[PDB]
Amino acid sequence: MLEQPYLDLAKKVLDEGHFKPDRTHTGTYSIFGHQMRFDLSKGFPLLTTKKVPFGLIKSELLWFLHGDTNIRFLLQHRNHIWDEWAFEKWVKSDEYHGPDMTDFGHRSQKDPEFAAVYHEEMAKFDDRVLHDDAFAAKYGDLGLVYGSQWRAWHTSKGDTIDQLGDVIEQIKTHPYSRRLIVSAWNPEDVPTMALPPCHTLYQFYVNDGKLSLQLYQRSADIFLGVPFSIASYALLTHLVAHECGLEVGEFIHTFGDAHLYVNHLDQIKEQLSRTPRPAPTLQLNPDKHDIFDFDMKDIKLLNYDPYPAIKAPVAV
Amino acid sequence: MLEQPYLDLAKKVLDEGHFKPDRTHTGTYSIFGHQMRFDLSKGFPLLTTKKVPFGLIKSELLWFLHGDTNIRFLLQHRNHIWDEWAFEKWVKSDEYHGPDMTDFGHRSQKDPEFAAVYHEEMAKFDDRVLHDDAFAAKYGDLGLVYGSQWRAWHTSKGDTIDQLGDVIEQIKTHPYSRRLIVSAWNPEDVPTMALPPCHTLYQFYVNDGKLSLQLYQRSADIFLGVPFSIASYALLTHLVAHECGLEVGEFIHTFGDAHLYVNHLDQIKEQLSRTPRPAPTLQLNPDKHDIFDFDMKDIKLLNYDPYPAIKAPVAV
Ligand SMILES: O=c1ccn([C@H]2C[C@H](O)[C@@H](COP(=O)(O)O)O2)c(=O)[nH]1
Ligand SMILES: O=c1ccn([C@H]2C[C@H](O)[C@@H](COP(=O)(O)O)O2)c(=O)[nH]1
């Protein structure tokens, strides 16, 4: 099936992967260097062997495309995928006067019911961000996230470079260009970032009226990470094409350190016992073409019949 | 043999590649997305099926490692691989008072004996660079080349970031880091560069006391380009390891647009008729360890028994 390269990736680290310790203190069976490709004309690569929230993917992509870096847009669409980054900063600020959330990450997955007071404090933060502009502007804005890196690269002379926007015009004006690249790896920021980009960079390729895309992911969480990455960049590929009047080609995914967290073995093992189903169909708004002005309503996922979802203990 | 992934890469674009037009106006049979790996414990990947100048590779690597961006170092070692970039600029300057070298690139491979006056003018330039400091400093310095990008990344606040130097300390202090990256793709320079980096970025990986490296090459000339790239980055991998006290692992090579120029078909076809030989052995100076202070004398290539060299018409 369309999503077999995924399953195979997992099986290869399960069988061939080596134990290697990491940043976050769980263990991982990790390999280094791996490539897999999805021909996007056969269907959209949203895993069927496990239910994956397209809405979270869609809303996260649209946020990116807007050069938006404020968590408020996400919360508006019920996407809480990025909260903890803003929360981390909230806690470390003069204004925070509440139940000390030190290392809350570990201290929630752990036995103490820190998570009880955690979630209510988070609910407060989220509401503040959603309703108080001054607050939203203060802690709701992350700054150095993809949308910033894609649509507002800060140069030395102080200006802003719209990498993505430029790259698209280049594809229209020079389809056969071996320089269609968008990078997220700024060497002058990585050393002070909490999470340097996982999706380091991507490259477009046009040939035969087909638009392909290759994504280089320096680090990957096979079970929790990779499923999203695939649908996100396959969706990007579809959108950019919809604009450049091109047809959709393949989505090549290259990996640096592809790893499986030791606390995800049973989970991944269970998923591998499933038999893939016919992939879903993506349907974009024909009349609308400016992908930078798209909204949830313009992207329709069709025929998605996934197996139920596998719950998994997140690391940290 | 050790270098079989190379030959196979070529055969795949020969058989599976599609015709696609490019920047330089020759044609190319090109594919998009491809990965190959060389286990550096089996030998050094300097092609045997064709004679490849290790000296040019070695001297080019040492120049890089010095953060050197002046062609003078190269000319000193008889490496003329980068001349035409400095020449291009010489010609476009107020001071140049000589036989107009317009589009000399095309106009040399072509029928006119422009190349006659070209090579003597180049010989003059090269001598000026080699002997006159003011001149060397004016046109002999390229500025935005690898060594600059690796050892002197210019930030917004005006300073200089020693990416490579930092990355090495990181490997010593954090071997299991999924962030060991050195990038050459600055978004604020690419739009005005004559040749944006082909070797966009690379990533290190440590595990089991083995140091691996993955290189992402956005564009590749299978016949003329790739052979060098392999030996250059395999040598880099060996040097960095020699320093970090680590053992050498693999060299993974990932490609964006891997292409074969249409005027190289017979040449590549001939090379494929050859049977690989036992690869050579790299021998570094044990006593010397600071790779940034290495010189030609510290890198010994052993047992290199290559087939004669295949001459090939360079494109442009
Ligand atoms: O879309 C995403 C976001 C995060 N991660 C994972 C990758 C690593 O498991 C961890 C980041 O760790 P570092 O490699 O940066 O240390 O989060 C993913 O796999 N995919
Ligand atoms: O080490 C090198 C240097 C240059 N090139 C080639 C790649 C392309 O054939 C051309 C640069 O073309 P663009 O893709 O940038 O347009 O030179 C290589 O393959 N390897």
Side-chain angles (χ1 to χ4, degrees):
Chain A
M1 251 48 210
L2 211 217
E3 45 100 281
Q4 195 60 50
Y6 174 71
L7 299 172
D8 292 339
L9 202 200
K11 312 201 283 203
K12 195 209 186 189
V13 2
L14 247 189
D15 296 336
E16 213 173 303
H18 275 133
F19 184 92
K20 179 184 178 284
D22 68 317
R23 184 198 83 173
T24 31
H25 282 291
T26 308
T28 65
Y29 276 113
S30 166
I31 64 178
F32 181 60
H34 181 92
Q35 186 181 264
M36 61 197 190
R37 45 174 78 219
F38 307 77
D39 177 3
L40 298 160
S41 67
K42 295 310 161 185
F44 187 75
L46 192 52
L47 297 203
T48 45
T49 60
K50 154 184 157 173
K51 190 173 180 185
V52 172
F54 193 48
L56 292 186
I57 295 175
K58 193 146 62 59
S59 67
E60 180 181 74
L61 197 46
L62 297 175
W63 182 63
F64 287 160
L65 294 193
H66 299 171
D68 202 326
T69 46
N70 201 296
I71 282 179
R72 182 183 278 189
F73 177 84
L74 297 191
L75 297 179
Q76 290 173 9
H77 295 82
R78 314 179 106 220
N79 182 327
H80 300 267
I81 292 176
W82 284 93
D83 303 352
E84 70 177 358
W85 303 103
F87 198 97
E88 144 221 332
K89 276 282 296 175
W90 170 219
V91 173
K92 75 172 75 165
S93 68
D94 301 87
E95 305 316 315
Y96 183 59
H97 306 325
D100 181 40
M101 313 301 296
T102 304
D103 201 14
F104 51 99
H106 287 247
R107 307 212 271 159
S108 270
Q109 296 301 138
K110 198 182 175 179
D111 33 80
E113 198 159 327
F114 192 75
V117 63
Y118 172 75
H119 292 108
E120 193 173 75
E121 274 298 303
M122 180 75 102
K124 297 177 186 291
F125 177 67
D126 282 13
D127 198 270
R128 287 278 283 160
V129 175
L130 284 176
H131 305 103
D132 188 5
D133 295 349
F135 192 83
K138 225 176 180 179
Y139 322 95
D141 171 36
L142 301 168
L144 292 178
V145 187
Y146 292 115
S148 187
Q149 288 141 178
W150 289 5
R151 306 218 48 202
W153 186 287
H154 258 92
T155 59
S156 308
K157 204 175 190 66
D159 200 48
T160 289
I161 293 288
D162 183 21
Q163 275 191 107
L164 193 59
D166 292 6
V167 139
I168 300 179
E169 184 69 17
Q170 269 293 309
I171 301 181
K172 298 175 182 181
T173 308
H174 305 301
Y176 301 110
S177 180
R178 305 173 288 220
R179 311 179 160 169
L180 298 177
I181 296 180
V182 177
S183 176
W185 199 264
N186 195 328
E188 77 167 303
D189 296 350
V190 182
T192 56
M193 284 191 273
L195 195 262
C198 276
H199 310 116
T200 304
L201 79 81
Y202 48 107
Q203 173 167 354
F204 290 104
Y205 175 89
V206 187
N207 196 345
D208 299 319
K210 295 296 166 59
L211 165 80
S212 292
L213 191 164
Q214 165 146 230
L215 189 220
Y216 183 99
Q217 184 159 356
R218 47 169 280 273
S219 187
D221 176 323
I222 306 304
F223 186 69
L224 291 193
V226 174
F228 275 76
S229 299
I230 297 170
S232 181
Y233 287 83
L235 223 210
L236 178 67
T237 307
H238 269 92
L239 287 185
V240 177
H242 177 75
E243 177 166 0
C244 308
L246 294 171
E247 226 77 85
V248 81
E250 311 188 357
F251 166 59
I252 296 149
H253 203 168
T254 302
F255 295 92
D257 180 314
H259 62 272
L260 201 51
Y261 279 91
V262 175
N263 59 343
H264 293 148
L265 293 174
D266 293 351
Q267 280 89 356
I268 199 61
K269 275 160 185 166
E270 131 78 79
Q271 197 185 148
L272 292 173
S273 75
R274 295 146 131 146
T275 325
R277 300 187 203 201
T281 299
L282 193 79
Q283 194 156 277
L284 303 169
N285 194 323
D287 301 48
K288 192 98 63 182
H289 282 277
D290 229 53
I291 67 165
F292 292 150
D293 297 332
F294 259 46
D295 182 54
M296 308 301 277
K297 60 181 182 61
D298 315 310
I299 309 158
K300 237 120 83 303
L301 184 62
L302 285 173
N303 314 324
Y304 185 42
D305 188 51
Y307 275 80
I310 301 184
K311 307 172 288 68
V314 183
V316 152
Chain B
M1 251 48 210
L2 211 217
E3 45 100 281
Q4 195 60 50
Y6 174 71
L7 299 172
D8 292 339
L9 202 200
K11 312 201 283 203
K12 195 209 186 189
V13 2
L14 247 189
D15 296 336
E16 213 173 303
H18 275 133
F19 184 92
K20 179 184 178 284
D22 68 317
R23 184 198 83 173
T24 31
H25 282 291
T26 308
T28 65
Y29 276 113
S30 166
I31 64 178
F32 181 60
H34 181 92
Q35 186 181 264
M36 61 197 190
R37 45 174 78 219
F38 307 77
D39 177 3
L40 298 160
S41 67
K42 295 310 161 185
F44 187 75
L46 191 52
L47 297 203
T48 45
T49 60
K50 154 184 157 173
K51 190 173 180 185
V52 172
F54 193 48
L56 292 186
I57 295 175
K58 193 146 62 59
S59 67
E60 180 181 74
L61 197 46
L62 297 175
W63 182 63
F64 287 160
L65 294 193
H66 299 171
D68 202 326
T69 46
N70 201 296
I71 282 179
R72 182 183 278 189
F73 177 84
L74 297 191
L75 297 179
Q76 290 173 9
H77 295 82
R78 314 179 106 220
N79 182 327
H80 300 267
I81 292 176
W82 284 93
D83 303 352
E84 70 177 358
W85 303 103
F87 198 97
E88 144 221 332
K89 276 282 296 175
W90 170 219
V91 173
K92 75 172 75 165
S93 68
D94 301 87
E95 305 316 315
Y96 183 59
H97 306 325
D100 181 40
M101 313 301 296
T102 304
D103 201 14
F104 51 99
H106 287 247
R107 307 212 271 159
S108 270
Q109 296 301 138
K110 198 182 175 179
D111 33 80
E113 198 159 327
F114 192 75
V117 63
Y118 172 75
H119 292 108
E120 193 173 75
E121 274 298 303
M122 180 75 102
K124 297 177 186 291
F125 177 67
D126 282 13
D127 198 270
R128 287 278 283 160
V129 175
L130 284 176
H131 305 103
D132 188 5
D133 295 349
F135 192 83
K138 225 176 180 179
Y139 322 95
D141 171 36
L142 301 168
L144 292 178
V145 187
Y146 292 115
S148 187
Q149 288 141 178
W150 289 5
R151 306 218 48 202
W153 186 287
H154 258 92
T155 59
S156 308
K157 204 175 190 66
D159 200 48
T160 289
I161 293 288
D162 183 21
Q163 275 191 107
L164 193 59
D166 292 6
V167 139
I168 300 179
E169 184 69 17
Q170 269 293 309
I171 301 181
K172 298 175 182 181
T173 308
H174 305 301
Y176 301 110
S177 180
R178 305 173 288 220
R179 311 179 160 169
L180 298 177
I181 296 180
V182 177
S183 176
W185 199 264
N186 195 328
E188 77 167 303
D189 296 350
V190 182
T192 56
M193 284 191 273
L195 195 262
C198 276
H199 310 116
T200 304
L201 79 81
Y202 48 107
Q203 173 167 354
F204 290 104
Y205 175 89
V206 187
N207 196 345
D208 299 319
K210 295 296 166 59
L211 165 80
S212 292
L213 191 164
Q214 165 146 230
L215 189 220
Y216 183 99
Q217 184 159 356
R218 47 169 280 273
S219 187
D221 176 323
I222 306 304
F223 186 69
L224 291 193
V226 174
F228 275 76
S229 299
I230 297 170
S232 181
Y233 287 83
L235 223 210
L236 178 67
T237 307
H238 269 92
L239 287 185
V240 177
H242 177 75
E243 177 166 0
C244 308
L246 294 171
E247 226 77 85
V248 81
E250 311 188 357
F251 166 59
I252 296 149
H253 203 168
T254 302
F255 295 92
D257 180 314
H259 62 272
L260 201 51
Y261 279 91
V262 175
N263 59 343
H264 293 148
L265 293 174
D266 293 351
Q267 280 89 356
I268 199 61
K269 275 160 185 166
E270 131 78 79
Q271 197 185 148
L272 292 173
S273 75
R274 295 146 131 146
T275 325
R277 300 187 203 201
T281 299
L282 193 79
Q283 194 156 277
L284 303 169
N285 194 323
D287 301 48
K288 192 98 63 182
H289 282 277
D290 229 53
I291 67 165
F292 292 150
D293 297 332
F294 259 46
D295 182 54
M296 308 301 277
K297 60 181 182 61
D298 315 310
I299 309 158
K300 237 120 83 303
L301 184 62
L302 285 173
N303 314 324
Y304 185 42
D305 188 51
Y307 275 80
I310 301 184
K311 307 172 288 68
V314 183
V316 152

